[PDB]
Amino acid sequence: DAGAFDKIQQIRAGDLNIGYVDIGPRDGQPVILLHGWPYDIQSYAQVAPALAQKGYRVIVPYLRGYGTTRFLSASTPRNGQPSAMAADIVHLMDALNIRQADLAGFDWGARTADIVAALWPQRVKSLVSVSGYLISSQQIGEKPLPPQAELSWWYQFYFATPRGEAGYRQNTHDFAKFIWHQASPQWQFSDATFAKTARALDNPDHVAITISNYRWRLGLEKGEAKYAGYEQRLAALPPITVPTITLEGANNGAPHPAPASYRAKFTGKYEHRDLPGAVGHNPPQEDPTAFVQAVVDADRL
Structure with a gap:
C-alpha cells in the first residue's frame, strides 16, 4: 500500500488522544519511532x-504538541517536561498491548526513548539514540556553556x-524552517518537504509545548507533581542497560x-556509529537507509 503511511490512527492513552501510524505485520517485532523538535512523523516516512x-x-506517533495528538482535557497542563513524554509513550504501549518494543529517536524523541529505556527497561528491547545520552536535569540545565555553544x-x-x-x-x-536549515546546513530539503511537517506544527498546543520544554530545561518552570518522582530518578543520570x-551525523549543526x-x-x-556525509540533525529523514540499518542492527545486538 503506497498510501499506508498516510493512514493516521487515533487512540486514548493517558492524558492524550495520540495520533500515530501503525504499519507492518500485526505479529511483527514492534518498533516505535519518535521524532524531534520541530519535526514530525514524516521523519520516518521512508524508514517505517x-x-x-x-x-x-x-x-510512529505524533508527540504531545504535534499533528493530531491532542490533550483529552482542556484543563491538563500543556507540559513539555521530559518524563511527561516518556509517560505518554508507555501509555501508548499499554493501550496497544505492546509489552516490549525496539525504540528509536532523535532530539526530543531520543530523549524520550532514552527515558523509557532507563526507567522501564523491561519495555525496551533495544534502542537507537541519535546524539547519544540525552537525559539531563534542571540543575544541569541552569549551568552555562561556552559562548559559542550558547549561540x-x-x-x-x-x-x-x-x-x-x-x-x-x-x-x-x-x-x-530556519531552525531546520541551522540544524542540518547541508540538507537540501524541498519547500514541500518542510511544509508537510509544518502542517503538524500548527497543532494548537505546539507553541505551549515547545516553550514549556525549553523553559523546563532551563529550570524556569516547575514540572507537575505526578512526574516529580521520575525527574528525581532522571536527575541521577541513570545508565541505560x-x-x-x-x-551521529558529520554535518549536524544542532548542539x-x-x-x-x-x-x-x-x-x-x-x-556507536558516525554516519558519513551531508547528514545533520535528522538522520532518519536525511539518511533513512542508514537509519533502517541501525534499527535492524540494534534489534539483533
Whole structure:
C-alpha cells in the first residue's frame, strides 16, 4: 500500500488522544519511532515502510504538541517536561498491548526513548539514540556553556521570554524552517518537504509545548507533581542497560555531545556509529537507509 503511511490512527492513552501510524505485520517485532523538535512523523516516512517490508510492526506517533495528538482535557497542563513524554509513550504501549518494543529517536524523541529505556527497561528491547545520552536535569540545565555553544542553543533562551513565545506563535512556520536549515546546513530539503511537517506544527498546543520544554530545561518552570518522582530518578543520570546503537551525523549543526562523552552511559551491549556525509540533525529523514540499518542492527545486538 503506497498510501499506508498516510493512514493516521487515533487512540486514548493517558492524558492524550495520540495520533500515530501503525504499519507492518500485526505479529511483527514492534518498533516505535519518535521524532524531534520541530519535526514530525514524516521523519520516518521512508524508514517505517522499509522496516515494515522487512517484517517489523512499526508505530510512529505524533508527540504531545504535534499533528493530531491532542490533550483529552482542556484543563491538563500543556507540559513539555521530559518524563511527561516518556509517560505518554508507555501509555501508548499499554493501550496497544505492546509489552516490549525496539525504540528509536532523535532530539526530543531520543530523549524520550532514552527515558523509557532507563526507567522501564523491561519495555525496551533495544534502542537507537541519535546524539547519544540525552537525559539531563534542571540543575544541569541552569549551568552555562561556552559562548559559542550558547549561540548554537540560542532559541531556547529566546523561548524563555514572552517575546520568544510571541515570535514562535506568530512566525511558527518560518521559525521552524530556519531552525531546520541551522540544524542540518547541508540538507537540501524541498519547500514541500518542510511544509508537510509544518502542517503538524500548527497543532494548537505546539507553541505551549515547545516553550514549556525549553523553559523546563532551563529550570524556569516547575514540572507537575505526578512526574516529580521520575525527574528525581532522571536527575541521577541513570545508565541505560538495554542494547543500544548511538548515531551521529558529520554535518549536524544542532548542539550535540561528543560520542566519547556518553560511552559509559550505556552499560549493556553497545555500538556507536558516525554516519558519513551531508547528514545533520535528522538522520532518519536525511539518511533513512542508514537509519533502517541501525534499527535492524540494534534489534539483533
